[PDB]
Amino acid sequence: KFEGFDNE
Amino acid sequence: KFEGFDNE
Amino acid sequence: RTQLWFHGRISREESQRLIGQQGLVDGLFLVRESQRNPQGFVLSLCHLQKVKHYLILPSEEEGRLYFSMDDGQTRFTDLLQLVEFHQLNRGILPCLLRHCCT
Amino acid sequence: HRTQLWFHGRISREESQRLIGQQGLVDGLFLVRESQRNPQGFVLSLCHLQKVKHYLILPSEEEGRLYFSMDDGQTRFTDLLQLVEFHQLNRGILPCLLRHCCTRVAL
Ligand SMILES: [K+]
Secondary structure, three states, rough: OOOOOOOO | OOOOOOOO | OOOOOOOOOHHHHHHHHHHHHHEEEOOOOOOEEOOOOOEEEEEEEEEEEEEEEEEEEEEOHHHHHHHHOOOOOOOEEOOOHHHHHHHHOOOOOOOOEEEEEO | OOOOOOOOOOHHHHHEEEEEHHHHHOOOEEEEEEEEOOOOEEEEEEEEOOHHHHHHHEEEEEEEEEEEEEEOOOOOOOHHHHHHHHOOOOOOOOOOOOOEEEOOOOO
């Protein structure tokens, strides 16, 4: 997970 | 799987 | 750097404007150098009429550099390998990479 | 794929096991060959735990675009070079990484 980003 | 082969 | 889908150090809003300018069709994508994380890259992808961003961070294994979007679960040598793989496989992405901003 | 160091063409399955043992039963040692049982398929022969394992690479089609896969289309590649380069960093269905290439002999 990365703040500001859609990664999951 | 394929007979003869180690695919799984 | 010489690829059509790579736009360099464009901003996040510029990527949302470029993707929206070409139509908000699922699969439209570009790769940009992140201005927020200067050592990282971003895959900007249109999905469900919405522009989504996927952080590409570099890391090293046995002094060998690789890039990943899932903390090393799936690794690639460069960005061309990452893009070409996800044109055929979804991975952690919600859809396939179909069309790029030329 | 023909210009790669790990591709040995249309050698036999036993031919692949003899070359790998001749170079050393190291984990990660591999080659890619054209299959003699399936003329349209290829095989990734990989040494793991001093045993040579063989993984069938089959061609398939999705709307006029050909791809290669080792898992019935769950993971797809445009050519064999993309398959090898991917599995040099990611295990996938393989028990280890593609680490060392089995080179062709110098005639
Ligand atoms: K900005």
